[PDB]
Motif scaffolding. Structure first.
Motif, PDB file in Angstrom:
ATOM      1  N   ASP A   1       8.991  12.092  -2.685  1.00 50.06           N
ATOM      2  CA  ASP A   1       7.550  12.862  -2.138  1.00 50.06           C
ATOM      3  C   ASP A   1       6.686  11.778  -1.620  1.00 50.06           C
ATOM      4  O   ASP A   1       5.281  12.146  -1.967  1.00 50.06           O
ATOM      5  CB  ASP A   1       6.970  13.600  -3.276  1.00 50.06           C
ATOM      6  N   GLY A   2       6.847  11.010  -0.907  1.00 53.18           N
ATOM      7  CA  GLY A   2       6.207  10.001  -0.088  1.00 53.18           C
ATOM      8  C   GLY A   2       5.372   8.894  -1.155  1.00 53.18           C
ATOM      9  O   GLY A   2       4.425   8.207  -0.932  1.00 53.18           O
ATOM     10  N   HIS A   3       6.113   8.899  -2.343  1.00 48.29           N
ATOM     11  CA  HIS A   3       5.685   7.859  -3.386  1.00 48.29           C
ATOM     12  C   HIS A   3       6.798   6.707  -3.631  1.00 48.29           C
ATOM     13  O   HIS A   3       7.873   7.058  -3.306  1.00 48.29           O
ATOM     14  CB  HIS A   3       5.080   8.319  -4.583  1.00 48.29           C
ATOM     15  N   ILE A   4       6.647   5.243  -3.581  1.00 47.29           N
ATOM     16  CA  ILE A   4       7.658   4.388  -3.707  1.00 47.29           C
ATOM     17  C   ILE A   4       7.699   4.120  -5.355  1.00 47.29           C
ATOM     18  O   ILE A   4       6.771   3.501  -5.934  1.00 47.29           O
ATOM     19  CB  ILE A   4       7.178   3.238  -3.068  1.00 47.29           C
ATOM     20  N   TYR A   5       9.236   4.154  -5.906  1.00 44.29           N
ATOM     21  CA  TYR A   5       9.240   3.769  -7.150  1.00 44.29           C
ATOM     22  C   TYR A   5       9.949   2.224  -7.013  1.00 44.29           C
ATOM     23  O   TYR A   5      10.849   1.984  -6.559  1.00 44.29           O
ATOM     24  CB  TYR A   5      10.225   4.737  -7.849  1.00 44.29           C
ATOM     25  N   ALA A   6       9.242   1.469  -7.817  1.00 47.56           N
ATOM     26  CA  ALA A   6       9.861   0.051  -7.926  1.00 47.56           C
ATOM     27  C   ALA A   6      10.383  -0.003  -9.288  1.00 47.56           C
ATOM     28  O   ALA A   6       9.764   0.291 -10.483  1.00 47.56           O
ATOM     29  CB  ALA A   6       8.763  -0.873  -7.857  1.00 47.56           C
ATOM     30  N   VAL A   7      11.619  -0.448  -9.251  1.00 45.36           N
ATOM     31  CA  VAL A   7      12.440  -0.304 -10.564  1.00 45.36           C
ATOM     32  C   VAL A   7      13.171  -1.599 -10.992  1.00 45.36           C
ATOM     33  O   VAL A   7      13.866  -2.426 -10.166  1.00 45.36           O
ATOM     34  CB  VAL A   7      13.698   0.474 -10.474  1.00 45.36           C
ATOM     35  N   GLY A   8      12.905  -2.039 -12.190  1.00 44.90           N
ATOM     36  CA  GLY A   8      13.338  -3.340 -12.853  1.00 44.90           C
ATOM     37  C   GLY A   8      13.078  -4.526 -12.147  1.00 44.90           C
ATOM     38  O   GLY A   8      11.945  -4.693 -11.753  1.00 44.90           O
ATOM     39  N   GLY A   9      13.929  -5.305 -12.200  1.00 44.62           N
ATOM     40  CA  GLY A   9      13.879  -6.809 -11.174  1.00 44.62           C
ATOM     41  C   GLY A   9      13.557  -7.556 -12.487  1.00 44.62           C
ATOM     42  O   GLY A   9      13.246  -7.314 -13.837  1.00 44.62           O
ATOM     43  N   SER A  10      13.395  -8.992 -12.216  1.00 47.89           N
ATOM     44  CA  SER A  10      12.953  -9.962 -13.007  1.00 47.89           C
ATOM     45  C   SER A  10      11.697 -10.717 -12.782  1.00 47.89           C
ATOM     46  O   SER A  10      11.244 -10.771 -11.742  1.00 47.89           O
ATOM     47  CB  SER A  10      14.141 -11.006 -13.349  1.00 47.89           C
ATOM     48  N   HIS A  11      11.172 -11.259 -13.582  1.00 52.75           N
ATOM     49  CA  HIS A  11       9.979 -12.265 -13.765  1.00 52.75           C
ATOM     50  C   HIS A  11      10.391 -13.550 -14.547  1.00 52.75           C
ATOM     51  O   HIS A  11      10.188 -13.445 -15.799  1.00 52.75           O
ATOM     52  CB  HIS A  11       8.708 -11.535 -13.940  1.00 52.75           C
ATOM     53  N   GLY A  12      10.901 -14.587 -13.944  1.00 52.65           N
ATOM     54  CA  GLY A  12      11.307 -15.678 -14.732  1.00 52.65           C
ATOM     55  C   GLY A  12      12.559 -14.976 -15.410  1.00 52.65           C
ATOM     56  O   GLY A  12      13.436 -14.382 -15.079  1.00 52.65           O
ATOM     57  N   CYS A  13      12.894 -15.400 -16.837  1.00 50.35           N
ATOM     58  CA  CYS A  13      13.798 -14.946 -17.762  1.00 50.35           C
ATOM     59  C   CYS A  13      13.455 -13.629 -18.471  1.00 50.35           C
ATOM     60  O   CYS A  13      14.370 -12.974 -19.167  1.00 50.35           O
ATOM     61  CB  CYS A  13      13.727 -15.917 -19.010  1.00 50.35           C
ATOM     62  N   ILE A  14      12.148 -12.808 -17.724  1.00 47.62           N
ATOM     63  CA  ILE A  14      12.004 -11.458 -18.098  1.00 47.62           C
ATOM     64  C   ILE A  14      12.733 -10.488 -17.285  1.00 47.62           C
ATOM     65  O   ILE A  14      12.699 -10.734 -16.295  1.00 47.62           O
ATOM     66  CB  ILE A  14      10.617 -11.164 -18.200  1.00 47.62           C
ATOM     67  N   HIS A  15      13.805  -9.520 -17.697  1.00 49.58           N
ATOM     68  CA  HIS A  15      14.435  -8.553 -17.244  1.00 49.58           C
ATOM     69  C   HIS A  15      13.973  -7.307 -17.509  1.00 49.58           C
ATOM     70  O   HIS A  15      13.911  -7.004 -18.506  1.00 49.58           O
ATOM     71  CB  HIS A  15      15.999  -8.754 -17.460  1.00 49.58           C
ATOM     72  N   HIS A  16      13.195  -6.830 -16.665  1.00 51.40           N
ATOM     73  CA  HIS A  16      12.437  -5.602 -16.914  1.00 51.40           C
ATOM     74  C   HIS A  16      13.284  -4.104 -16.692  1.00 51.40           C
ATOM     75  O   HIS A  16      14.356  -4.277 -16.382  1.00 51.40           O
ATOM     76  CB  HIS A  16      11.506  -5.351 -15.411  1.00 51.40           C
ATOM     77  N   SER A  17      12.736  -3.288 -17.812  1.00 52.50           N
ATOM     78  CA  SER A  17      13.167  -1.965 -17.750  1.00 52.50           C
ATOM     79  C   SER A  17      11.968  -1.311 -17.343  1.00 52.50           C
ATOM     80  O   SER A  17      12.384  -0.034 -16.915  1.00 52.50           O
ATOM     81  CB  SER A  17      13.446  -1.524 -19.340  1.00 52.50           C
ATOM     82  N   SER A  18      10.786  -1.713 -17.160  1.00 54.87           N
ATOM     83  CA  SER A  18       9.756  -0.951 -16.451  1.00 54.87           C
ATOM     84  C   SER A  18       9.959  -0.333 -15.247  1.00 54.87           C
ATOM     85  O   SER A  18      10.631  -1.065 -14.382  1.00 54.87           O
ATOM     86  CB  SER A  18       8.492  -1.806 -16.711  1.00 54.87           C
ATOM     87  N   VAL A  19       9.093   0.485 -14.870  1.00 55.89           N
ATOM     88  CA  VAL A  19       9.231   1.138 -13.567  1.00 55.89           C
ATOM     89  C   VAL A  19       7.839   1.777 -13.265  1.00 55.89           C
ATOM     90  O   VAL A  19       7.041   1.921 -13.988  1.00 55.89           O
ATOM     91  CB  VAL A  19      10.044   2.585 -13.750  1.00 55.89           C
ATOM     92  N   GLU A  20       7.450   1.551 -11.932  1.00 60.48           N
ATOM     93  CA  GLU A  20       6.154   1.870 -11.507  1.00 60.48           C
ATOM     94  C   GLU A  20       5.850   2.402 -10.201  1.00 60.48           C
ATOM     95  O   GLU A  20       6.910   2.292  -9.238  1.00 60.48           O
ATOM     96  CB  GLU A  20       5.103   0.532 -11.510  1.00 60.48           C
ATOM     97  N   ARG A  21       5.178   3.270  -9.813  1.00 58.65           N
ATOM     98  CA  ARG A  21       5.033   4.374  -8.724  1.00 58.65           C
ATOM     99  C   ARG A  21       3.957   4.000  -7.726  1.00 58.65           C
ATOM    100  O   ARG A  21       2.735   3.935  -8.446  1.00 58.65           O
ATOM    101  CB  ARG A  21       5.061   5.827  -9.252  1.00 58.65           C
ATOM    102  N   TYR A  22       4.034   3.671  -6.617  1.00 55.86           N
ATOM    103  CA  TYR A  22       2.986   3.514  -5.616  1.00 55.86           C
ATOM    104  C   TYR A  22       2.485   4.658  -4.907  1.00 55.86           C
ATOM    105  O   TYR A  22       3.705   5.467  -4.244  1.00 55.86           O
ATOM    106  CB  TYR A  22       3.425   2.495  -4.571  1.00 55.86           C
ATOM    107  N   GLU A  23       1.252   4.861  -4.709  1.00 58.01           N
ATOM    108  CA  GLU A  23       0.901   6.144  -3.842  1.00 58.01           C
ATOM    109  C   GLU A  23       0.180   5.535  -2.739  1.00 58.01           C
ATOM    110  O   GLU A  23      -0.969   4.909  -2.808  1.00 58.01           O
ATOM    111  CB  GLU A  23      -0.154   7.098  -4.852  1.00 58.01           C
ATOM    112  N   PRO A  24       0.860   5.605  -1.304  1.00 51.53           N
ATOM    113  CA  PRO A  24      -0.007   5.134  -0.236  1.00 51.53           C
ATOM    114  C   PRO A  24      -1.206   5.652   0.238  1.00 51.53           C
ATOM    115  O   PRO A  24      -2.143   5.035   0.583  1.00 51.53           O
ATOM    116  CB  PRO A  24       1.306   5.517   0.982  1.00 51.53           C
ATOM    117  N   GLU A  25      -1.460   6.873  -0.335  1.00 52.69           N
ATOM    118  CA  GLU A  25      -2.723   7.578   0.139  1.00 52.69           C
ATOM    119  C   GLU A  25      -3.930   7.053  -0.547  1.00 52.69           C
ATOM    120  O   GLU A  25      -5.004   6.989  -0.354  1.00 52.69           O
ATOM    121  CB  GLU A  25      -2.573   9.080  -0.076  1.00 52.69           C
TER     122      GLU A  25
END
Ligand SMILES: CN(Cc1cc([C@H](CC(=O)O)c2ccc3c(c2)nnn3C)ccc1Cl)S(=O)(=O)c1ccccc1
Ligand SMILES: [Cl-]
Length: 289
Positions: A98-122
């Motif tokens: 629905d025009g929103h971007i979900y960014a899922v997981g990935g790492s930051h150094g030794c941190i392996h994310h379970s977190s998820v966040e959503r971008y709203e272009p508008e």
């Protein structure tokens, strides 16, 4: 739109390349470089705009995980910075609903994310949503019927065959049937009523196998394997066919681009990238200018 865009990636170091392939004529066009080199990023398209999300700049002068979101306008051939994510996310997966971007997981150094966040272009804003049940880097993400799927990856300890589904209106993740294959850095996409997972890495080997999940049957089934074993491949759909781009086979950073025909259950070589690379972001939109 009409072109397959490949952004960033890795060969010797993280890359800034943006190049667009035209399946109609076999041509490659080199377009405006990313402002910052990055490998392990994801690409997506919203409203005909191409976005490059997360990754890491592995450079001879340091290694920096990216929380960046950048927007490419094919009409202007220009990259513009958007709001950054809450956290850096290298080896990220993304999905658009629905025009929103979900960014899922990935790492930051030794941190392996379970977190998820959503971008709203508008409003050029990120907001965290429910975290996945599992930490996942090298995670495959697809969207089917306005549901978001996170597939395989690496949790910090083990490569995963597990997969889960996010139900936006419940802000909730639930496990789905696991794949038959452990896959980290697979290419994951949707075609018809199925989520496909192609290739990846299992801790030992880069894979050529391909399997697909039918949401109606909740089962995974292997289809024809790719011609090349590959992990950290880029994947996209263009006119009802899957395209896989580059990746690593345990020997070479591949320039190979293969295409899958679901009707004949066959993979074919379609073109070569202008140079071998892995960990690219890929998406499809209109031709520039
Ligand atoms: C290979 N790229 C990084 C990447 C790695 C993995 C996995 C992570 C894991 O399972 O631990 C991975 C790790 C090791 C692998 C593997 C997959 N396949 N072979 N080998 C030896 C999954 C996705 C991406 Cl984009 S990349 O192209 O961005 C890259 C390449 C070299 C250096 C840095 C980044
Ligand atoms: Cl990396």
């Amino acid at each position: 739109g009409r072109l397959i865009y490949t952004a960033g990636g890795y060969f010797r170091q993280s890359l800034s390349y943006l190049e667009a392939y035209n399946p109609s004529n076999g041509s490659w066009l080199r377009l405006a470089d990313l402002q910052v080199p990055r490998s392990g990023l994801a690409g997506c398209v919203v409203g005909g705009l191409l976005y490059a999300v997360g990754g890491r700049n592995n450079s001879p002068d340091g290694n920096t995980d990216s929380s960046a979101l950048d927007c490419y306008n094919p009409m202007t051939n220009q990259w513009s910075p958007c709001a950054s994510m809450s956290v850096p996310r290298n080896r990220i997966g993304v999905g658009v609903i629905d025009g929103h971007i979900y960014a899922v997981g990935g790492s930051h150094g030794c941190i392996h994310h379970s977190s998820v966040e959503r971008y709203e272009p508008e409003r050029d804003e990120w907001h965290l949503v429910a975290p996945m049940l599992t930490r996942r880097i090298g995670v495959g993400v697809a969207v089917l019927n306005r549901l978001l799927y996170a597939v395989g990856g690496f949790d910090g300890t083990n490569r995963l065959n597990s997969a889960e589904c996010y139900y936006p209106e419940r802000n909730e993740w639930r496990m789905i049937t696991p794949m038959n294959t452990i896959r980290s850095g697979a290419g994951v996409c949707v075609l018809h009523n199925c989520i496909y997972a192609a290739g990846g890495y299992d801790g030992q080997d880069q894979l050529n196998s391909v399997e697909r999940y039918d949401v109606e049957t909740e089962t995974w089934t292997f289809v024809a394997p790719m011609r090349h074993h590959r992990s950290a491949l880029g994947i996209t759909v263009h006119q009802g066919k899957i395209y896989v781009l580059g990746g690593y086979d345990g020997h070479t950073f591949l320039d190979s681009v293969e295409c899958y025909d679901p009707d004949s259950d066959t993979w074919s070589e379609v073109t070569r990238m202008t140079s071998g690379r892995s960990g690219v972001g890929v998406a499809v939109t209109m031709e520039p200018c």
